[PDB]
Amino acid sequence: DSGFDLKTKQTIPQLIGLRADTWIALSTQDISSDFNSNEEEESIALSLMSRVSAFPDSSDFGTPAFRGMIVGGAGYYTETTRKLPVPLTLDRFRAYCRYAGASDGVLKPEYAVDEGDARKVQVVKSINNLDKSWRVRRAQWNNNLVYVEDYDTNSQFYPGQQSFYSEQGSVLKAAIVGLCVANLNRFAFEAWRDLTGTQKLTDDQLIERSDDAVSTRGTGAFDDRLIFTPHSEITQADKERGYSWSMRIDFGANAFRTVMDMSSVAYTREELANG
Amino acid sequence: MSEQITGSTPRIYYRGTKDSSVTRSTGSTTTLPLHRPLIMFFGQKGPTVPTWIDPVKFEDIYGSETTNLSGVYCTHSTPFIKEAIAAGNQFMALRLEPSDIPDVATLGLSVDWVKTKIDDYERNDDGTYKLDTNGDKIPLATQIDGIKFRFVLEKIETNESGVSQYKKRTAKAGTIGTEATPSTITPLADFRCRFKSSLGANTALRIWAPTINSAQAADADLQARIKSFLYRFQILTRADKASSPTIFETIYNEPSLSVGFGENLVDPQTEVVYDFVERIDSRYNDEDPSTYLMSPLDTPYLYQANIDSVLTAIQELEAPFDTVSADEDDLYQINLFGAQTVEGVPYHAVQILGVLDGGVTLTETATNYLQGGGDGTLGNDSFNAAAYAVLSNLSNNAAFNITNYARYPFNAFWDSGFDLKTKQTIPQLIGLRADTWIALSTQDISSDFNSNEEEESIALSLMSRVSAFPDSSDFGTPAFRGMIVGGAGYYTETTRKLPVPLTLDRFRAYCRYAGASDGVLKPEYAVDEGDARKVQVVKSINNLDKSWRVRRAQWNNNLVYVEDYDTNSQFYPGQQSFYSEQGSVLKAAIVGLCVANLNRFAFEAWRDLTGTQKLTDDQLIERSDDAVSTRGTGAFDDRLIFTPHSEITQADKERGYSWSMRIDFGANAFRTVMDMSSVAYTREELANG
Description:
Radius of gyration of chain A: 23 Å
Domain Tail sheath protein gp29 gp29PR (chain B): 144-376
Shape of chain A: globular
Organism (chain B): Klebsiella phage vB_KpM_FBKp24
Oligomer: part of a larger assembly
Protein name (chain B): Putative tail sheath protein
Strand content of chain A: 15-25%
Helix content of chain A: 25-40%
Number of helices of chain A: 9
Strand order of the largest sheet of chain A: 4-3-5
Structural class of chain A: alpha+beta
């Protein structure tokens, strides 16, 4: 979302309902209007979350959707002399283009979107509402928004880049894992496209070739964010039907720690030096 | 002398002799020293939010009149600002304003416009030299139908609700030629001051239309190449209502600009833009943090519809006439403020009413000043009021939240003599922030010097206030980040009699010691050794004849006080902090600032490590310690010895998203008492045996 009005913002979420290999980034800003206040940010966030809740990941079991994220904030584009407002989705878009856009389909370790100089804002300035209160920041975090903070007097950084998954699962808490899963869903389609409609196959060859395809395509591509494993077979319902086979992927991921403590104790110089 | 650089023709141009011009000084990249103070003050211009500043640029960010002790902006913190600038501390400025400050200065331009028959004058030749009965000849034609103008420059009036009409002026009935109603005032442009101060009331502007004969000769080739008449624009500023103006040059060191009416006046031969507002705003301003300068004028506004209508009217009238081009695009060539083309041929059928007729003469010598504005009510009383307004409302201020560690790197606050009501809102800084340090004073600079009993009473009250913000709310450790300094005197670095407290002297000492931009304490300025332990910027201190009981009581109550070194000078027998317990680790005051810096280093470690997908527990733990030790080692000049330890305790295992750090540090104290005794010996039994 590059800044569509709120009427158009509410027709985008249906992509992650109509397709199983799609990933959406939403913006809480309308570039044709004034920079929003904290209350308007919260209201638009709630409205977008309500819209998104209508497209569960699994309709059979009602898994909450997790492919995408919502980013709040706005500023001015730095790569031009003119005055041209933009939302922070532009900065995240540039980061992702550099990270996961290589023509050879393997993630670049040198552009990790949350390590080094990629975790700071780079193409936006004069961001707004940077004096959020603790309660406002806590509310946004609990509503699963992605927001920036001040790094130093000159710049900003992302304390944590999470997706709009609403549950307590720690597997689906990073936004990049959603893109990885979308790619897995694409690989499964490729396997089917290759194996469909062949006269002389046997069931064992079909089952073996599906797993071979998915594993060969996926292994070595995700820069160690995921670990996955496919399994193809022919269940009893497939035996009954006679023209279908099943595949099922098992995958796992991690999360990230975000809180630190601080304490001190005063010693005399001698007992601290030796004792 | 007069003609300007038009092109590449071989030539040497002489710009005459001139007197020296002030040159704006370039600044350097900002850093974090160990001493990072916040200073609130009244100013002439500049932003009204906290700003991290390198002292080289204070003069040209906040105007050079704010540091003048004899000016109107002097308050009880100007000495602090001057000392900071002298020592070279990158510090955080906060410009306050009085609660009754007026709005900005404004000036609108308009033309009184009418049509009527007028006279016509003789002509010597096609040059159309003759005018106004020059020579000996009466005007020739009986009556020539034409147009009458009368220019007006005046303040832009506000709405009845109290809102300016900066962009919302409208035409009205005129006054010249009232025999015909259509005499109308129509607006042409608006100008507004950028800041809220007397600088706007003293700012002035000039606009004129030159010809080939001017002191700044124009060129017809450029106007032919891009069809638009070029006007000269100039900005001036004066010191006070009685002084004389001085030209405010552009960032390229020029006295005036050439501008023109139209959409985009781009020159193909050189790619230069002659648009009015764009050119003015781009040439007179410079926002680069290292070379920073803002023009007193804001961005001009222009009434395109009305200017276009008047140009169209005059073109339709006289463009198809004897001595003016009739083409369509000549509309923007039409000379409006003058009455002639670039070559200097007068427009007959146009009459501009002069001064005696109630008009304004737009020439290079006329000057026009913005109307309105002001600074407000200045002085120590209003300064204290504003400071209290800011300090009391810290948890719900809509201007800025100062619990933001990353955005507001200040770590010290010195009491320069605020009144007792404002004094009691300062201690909460070391309650709201864990990397802050405060110095307090027992003297209200606007009152008479306190006596011994008043000193004691104020000290007790401040201690009681400080007792409400313990360092560790969990275990109730008493606060130790700061100190209280008692005494007052007079400032020595000026002829005027200007009382100041001794917090100023200790402020200068700390600035010199812990103010290096590379973040390392300077051993040659140790605040308690050599010549830095004497009073240097205060004289005629009071209550120097304290009795032994009074001195003992003050020491027990944890004040910092001075004594007589010799017949001429004073010194500090011991500079302790307001820690109220018996521990000898936290007895010195500089150690408190060292500990504040340690707390800052912890925040930096967190900021760098937070929120990473692919880290492990061991790497997180190791990197935290690496950061803290690498940052802090070798900077505290042997005042402290510290050691960090990160880990993931059982509570962290439960939570799954947190890790812990703990720093162990140790320090020393000082001796203050000596005994004395003697024994008498005979010369022999003393010399041998």
